[PDB]
Design a protein around this nucleic acid. Structure first.
Ligand SMILES: CC(=O)O[C@@H]1[C@@H](O)[C@H](O[C@H]2[C@H](OC(=O)[C@H]3CC[C@@H]4[C@H](C3)O[C@@]3(C[C@H](OC(=O)/C=C/c5ccccc5)[C@H](C)CO3)[C@]43CO3)O[C@H](C)[C@@H](O)[C@@H]2OC(C)=O)O[C@H](C)[C@H]1O
Ligand SMILES: [Mg+2]
Ligand SMILES: [Mg+2]
Ligand SMILES: [Mg+2]
Ligand SMILES: [Mg+2]
Ligand SMILES: [Mg+2]
Ligand SMILES: [Mg+2]
Ligand SMILES: [Mg+2]
Ligand SMILES: [Mg+2]
Ligand SMILES: [Mg+2]
Ligand SMILES: [Mg+2]
Ligand SMILES: [Mg+2]
Ligand SMILES: [Mg+2]
Ligand SMILES: [Mg+2]
Ligand SMILES: [Mg+2]
Ligand SMILES: [Mg+2]
Ligand SMILES: [Mg+2]
Ligand SMILES: [Mg+2]
Ligand SMILES: [Mg+2]
Ligand SMILES: [Mg+2]
Ligand SMILES: [Mg+2]
Ligand SMILES: [Mg+2]
Ligand SMILES: [Mg+2]
Ligand SMILES: [Mg+2]
Ligand SMILES: [Mg+2]
Ligand SMILES: [Mg+2]
Ligand SMILES: [Mg+2]
Ligand SMILES: [Mg+2]
Ligand SMILES: [Mg+2]
Ligand SMILES: [Mg+2]
Ligand SMILES: [Mg+2]
Ligand SMILES: [Mg+2]
Ligand SMILES: [Mg+2]
Ligand SMILES: [Mg+2]
Ligand SMILES: [Mg+2]
Ligand SMILES: [Mg+2]
Ligand SMILES: [Mg+2]
Ligand SMILES: [Mg+2]
Ligand SMILES: [Mg+2]
Ligand SMILES: [Mg+2]
Ligand SMILES: [Mg+2]
Ligand SMILES: [Mg+2]
Ligand SMILES: [Mg+2]
Ligand SMILES: [Mg+2]
Ligand SMILES: [Mg+2]
Ligand SMILES: [Mg+2]
Ligand SMILES: [Mg+2]
Ligand SMILES: [Mg+2]
Ligand SMILES: [Mg+2]
Ligand SMILES: [Mg+2]
Ligand SMILES: [Mg+2]
Ligand SMILES: [Mg+2]
Ligand SMILES: [Mg+2]
Ligand SMILES: [Mg+2]
Ligand SMILES: [Mg+2]
Ligand SMILES: [Mg+2]
Ligand SMILES: [Mg+2]
Ligand SMILES: [Mg+2]
Ligand SMILES: [Mg+2]
Ligand SMILES: [Mg+2]
Ligand SMILES: [Mg+2]
Ligand SMILES: [Mg+2]
Ligand SMILES: [Mg+2]
Ligand SMILES: [Mg+2]
Ligand SMILES: [Mg+2]
Ligand SMILES: [Mg+2]
Ligand SMILES: [Mg+2]
Ligand SMILES: [Mg+2]
Ligand SMILES: [Mg+2]
Ligand SMILES: [Mg+2]
Ligand SMILES: [Mg+2]
Ligand SMILES: [Mg+2]
Ligand SMILES: [Mg+2]
Ligand SMILES: [Mg+2]
Ligand SMILES: [Mg+2]
Ligand SMILES: [Mg+2]
Ligand SMILES: [Mg+2]
Ligand SMILES: [Mg+2]
Ligand SMILES: [Mg+2]
Ligand SMILES: [Mg+2]
Ligand SMILES: [Mg+2]
Ligand SMILES: [Mg+2]
Lengths: 217, 67
RNA sequence: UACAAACCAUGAAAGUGUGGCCUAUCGAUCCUUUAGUCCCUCGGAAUUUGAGGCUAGAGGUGCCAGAAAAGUUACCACAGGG
RNA sequence: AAGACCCUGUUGAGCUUGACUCUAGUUUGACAUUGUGAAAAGACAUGGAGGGUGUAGAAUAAGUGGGAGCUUCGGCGCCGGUGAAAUACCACUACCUCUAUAGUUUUUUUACUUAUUCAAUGAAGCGGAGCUGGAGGUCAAACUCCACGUUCUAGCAUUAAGCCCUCUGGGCGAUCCGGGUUGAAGACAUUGUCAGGUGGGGAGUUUGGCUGGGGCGGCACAUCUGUUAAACGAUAACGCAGGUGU
RNA sequence: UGAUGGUCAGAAAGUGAUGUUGACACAAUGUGAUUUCUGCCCAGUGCUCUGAAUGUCAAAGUGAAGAAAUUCAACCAAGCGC
RNA sequence: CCAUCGACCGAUCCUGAUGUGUUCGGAUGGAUUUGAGUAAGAGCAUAGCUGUUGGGACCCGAAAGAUGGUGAACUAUGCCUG
RNA sequence: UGACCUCAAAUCAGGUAGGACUACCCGCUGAACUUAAGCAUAUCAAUAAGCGGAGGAAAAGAAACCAACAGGGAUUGCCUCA
């Protein structure tokens, strides 16, 4: 039966809010990183999975971004929008292993515009991209600041080759219960992605850059 | 098919001090395992060695001793 | 056996062909099994397994309208029978 | 004297047998009765702590979500250069290993005794220890072992003599301790329930028809050709010459 | 057949016969005084003996697939087979 | 009321409109098929004869089977005492 | 020198059970003749016989009921369902 315990996660985000308001810390709010256990599966043998919905509130409170290109790009994220780019290395580079490797290891997300359909599997391809990059579906007549602020809420949950995958998002600024079920509104992918779905769970841990675990599933 | 000699352990035979050349020779037995110790299945063995060997002199060539 | 409604074979065609040129060459209820319709039911409401139905074959009864079946009696019994 | 021989009846019975169908009993297995230890091959789980590449980073990754001297210090220092992935890292998770805690865990061996099982006695002397001698040869100091009232005789042995303390009684005589009557057997037997085998010892029943009696034979029992069949058709017999289950 | 036994009894039992018994005994058969002899056959049917490896092989147990009912497989006591 | 040819209802097979939870719906028009039907109700009730089935079944009749009891005053065998 | 627990004895003090009847009633146990035109599952029949236990009635009884409705509402009996 579904091991959902919102009341369990309520007292837990408070115990997280303990080492993030009470107990001890630097002073304030940080990176929420509650974990699971993940058993009853198989990193090999079966296949793959993925699931991304833009989580209720804002996770990454200081998201890192590198808007690729200029064409129809930048011109949509000038002035009030920061970041952007000035091509330059889009004609050079492409031989330097770094710079693009630097861009990947520096900033946390790029874009996809409408001209990036070339660069992602051409100027990079085996050089980058497939190594762990996700172009952002952004164009002109779109949601703009709304759908790229929702990028902070655009989580993932893909499969690799480890029975770990206990990632999390959010920050402690959230009200007493703003998380709790917001994290539960992230478990939905993680459920449907596994084989027996709600069964392939081994444990569960409430934690951040501040806690250990407070007796959870 | 198995070469039973890989599991054999060699032991040294010592004669009593009444004789002179107490280094009689060597024997073997299956190596000591969990079920059977090599020691207990090894006691009770009898060696028949000529007395001339136990004393060096060839005058005892016609007597043979069981140890 | 002769037609009715299909789908085919053959022949230039008319025609012929619904097993063997004709007169013999074979098999119910119950059960099982396969095929068909992919249809009806499991009766508090559903899904999927399973089960049960409807139609057509096979498995067989040769004592062949189709029980499941070894002897002995001079120790013998009963109902009868010209 | 409602043939006892003979036949018929979809009537029996006594008896027999690998006839059909069963059965008491018995055998074999599993579960329960069923508990306590040790060892073996091993598997696990749980607590520890610890472990790692082929290059390149001289620096040993084995993972994936992030900042900043936390620990007086500042050894090593904290994304910027070197790798596919980074040198105090941490918040913790996730795997795996090859070391340890003495956790349950399967199969084989042997220890226990309290369940269960066998036997005896008017539940009489059990278990352990100690006195006394006989030995070991003592080589420190008495450790080990043995014995601890009866054997020429077809008699007798029963309700303590004696000693100590005074307490018409207490003790020794008759060594102390444990109140397990004493052996055997033992978690196996046995017993309970299913399961496989065996089971004329026993139970129930059956064991065609036609037929010049019945039986044996044959099939005239389902059938086909020609004829008997007597000029439509029909027509019997264990009539004639033959055929079918392919 | 050496008693945790042979043969037999009982529906069961903390139940019985042999048994106040112990192989010179009890129990089961065949033949049938004495004399002289009891030949060949163990292939059949029984009875009996070993089971180290070993075909078949129940329930329980084990493994796998499945959502499960279930299915499949390995192992498999005695007996049969040898 | 008789023979005959039709119509309607249900089952079976064929066709498959507007439409649609796009797989449901099933208009319309057909078919040597089929029902114990419709097609201006005839039934319900009581009684009687005759006929049917189950019953003791027109009356009497077995050899057998089962359940529960009574006998070793005869007689078979053992024991005890004469 | 006294409690407690367990277990005994008494012609202790005072009580209570047994046995009977058969038509009905509550249970256990349990056939076969018979029918099937044979017969074994089946039927006779959850019947006869055998055993235990009551009363004027016994038993059952105030839902771990029936339902599938617009819901009924302890048990029992008749009529019906059938
Ligand atoms: C092998 C043996 O010696 O005995 C078998 C027996 O095992 C078999 O018992 C079956 C048994 O048979 C029956 O109960 C009857 C079914 C129909 C009757 C008869 C028996 O079979 C008949 C006769 C003949 O079909 C057969 O014969 C059938 C054999 C069969 C085998 C297995 C499964 C089903 C049928 C007709 C075609 C119609 O069917 C029928 C009309 O007489 O049904 C059970 C469901 C089956 O499991 C059961 O099968 C087994 C292995 O036990 O019955 C056969 C007649 C016997 O030959
Ligand atoms: Mg034609
Ligand atoms: Mg047939
Ligand atoms: Mg048929
Ligand atoms: Mg139902
Ligand atoms: Mg339904
Ligand atoms: Mg129909
Ligand atoms: Mg016939
Ligand atoms: Mg006939
Ligand atoms: Mg005679
Ligand atoms: Mg005669
Ligand atoms: Mg005679
Ligand atoms: Mg006559
Ligand atoms: Mg007569
Ligand atoms: Mg007569
Ligand atoms: Mg007849
Ligand atoms: Mg008979
Ligand atoms: Mg007979
Ligand atoms: Mg008789
Ligand atoms: Mg018996
Ligand atoms: Mg047994
Ligand atoms: Mg046992
Ligand atoms: Mg002693
Ligand atoms: Mg005694
Ligand atoms: Mg013992
Ligand atoms: Mg046992
Ligand atoms: Mg037993
Ligand atoms: Mg017994
Ligand atoms: Mg049996
Ligand atoms: Mg028999
Ligand atoms: Mg018989
Ligand atoms: Mg017959
Ligand atoms: Mg006859
Ligand atoms: Mg004949
Ligand atoms: Mg004629
Ligand atoms: Mg002829
Ligand atoms: Mg032929
Ligand atoms: Mg004897
Ligand atoms: Mg003989
Ligand atoms: Mg002879
Ligand atoms: Mg010869
Ligand atoms: Mg022979
Ligand atoms: Mg023989
Ligand atoms: Mg073997
Ligand atoms: Mg099995
Ligand atoms: Mg299984
Ligand atoms: Mg099922
Ligand atoms: Mg075997
Ligand atoms: Mg054998
Ligand atoms: Mg029809
Ligand atoms: Mg359409
Ligand atoms: Mg419509
Ligand atoms: Mg009509
Ligand atoms: Mg009419
Ligand atoms: Mg009418
Ligand atoms: Mg009469
Ligand atoms: Mg009548
Ligand atoms: Mg009548
Ligand atoms: Mg009569
Ligand atoms: Mg009679
Ligand atoms: Mg009878
Ligand atoms: Mg009687
Ligand atoms: Mg008498
Ligand atoms: Mg009194
Ligand atoms: Mg009183
Ligand atoms: Mg009474
Ligand atoms: Mg009668
Ligand atoms: Mg009859
Ligand atoms: Mg009759
Ligand atoms: Mg009869
Ligand atoms: Mg009935
Ligand atoms: Mg009955
Ligand atoms: Mg009965
Ligand atoms: Mg009665
Ligand atoms: Mg009574
Ligand atoms: Mg009264
Ligand atoms: Mg009254
Ligand atoms: Mg009452
Ligand atoms: Mg109530
Ligand atoms: Mg009611
Ligand atoms: Mg009522
Ligand atoms: Mg009616």
């Amino acid at each position: 039966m579904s091991k959902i315990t919102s009341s369990g996660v309520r007292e837990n985000v408070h115990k997280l809010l303990e080492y993030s308001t009470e107990t001890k810390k630097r002073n304030f709010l940080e990176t929420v990183e509650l974990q699971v256990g993940l058993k009853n599966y198989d990193p090999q043998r079966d296949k793959r999975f993925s699931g991304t919905l833009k989580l209720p509130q804002v996770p990454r409170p200081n998201m890192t971004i590198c808007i690729f290109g200029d064409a129809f790009d930048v011109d949509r994220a000038k002035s009030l929008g920061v970041d952007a780019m000035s091509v330059d290395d889009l004609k050079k580079l492409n031989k330097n292993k770094k710079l693009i490797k630097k861009l990947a290891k520096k900033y946390n997300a790029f874009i996809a515009s409408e001209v990036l359909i070339k660069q992602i599997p051409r100027l990079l391809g085996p050089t980058l991209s497939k190594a762990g990059k996700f172009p952002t579906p952004v164009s002109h007549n779109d949601d703009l600041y709304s759908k790229v602020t929702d990028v902070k809420s655009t989580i993932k949950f893909q499969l690799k080759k480890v029975l770990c995958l206990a990632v999390a998002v959010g920050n402690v600024d959230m009200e007493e219960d703003v998380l709790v079920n917001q994290i539960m509104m992230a478990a939905n992918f993680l459920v449907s992605l596994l084989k027996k779905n709600w069964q392939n769970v081994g444990s569960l841990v409430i934690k951040s850059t501040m806690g250990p675990s407070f007796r959870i599933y | 098919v198995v070469d039973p000699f890989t599991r054999k352990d060699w032991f040294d035979i010592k004669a009593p001090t009444t004789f002179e050349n107490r280094n009689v020779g060597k024997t073997l037995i299956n190596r000591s395992t969990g079920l059977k110790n090599a020691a207990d299945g090894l006691k009770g063995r009898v060696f028949e060695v000529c007395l001339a060997d136990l004393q060096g002199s060839e005058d005892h060539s016609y007597r043979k001793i069981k140890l």
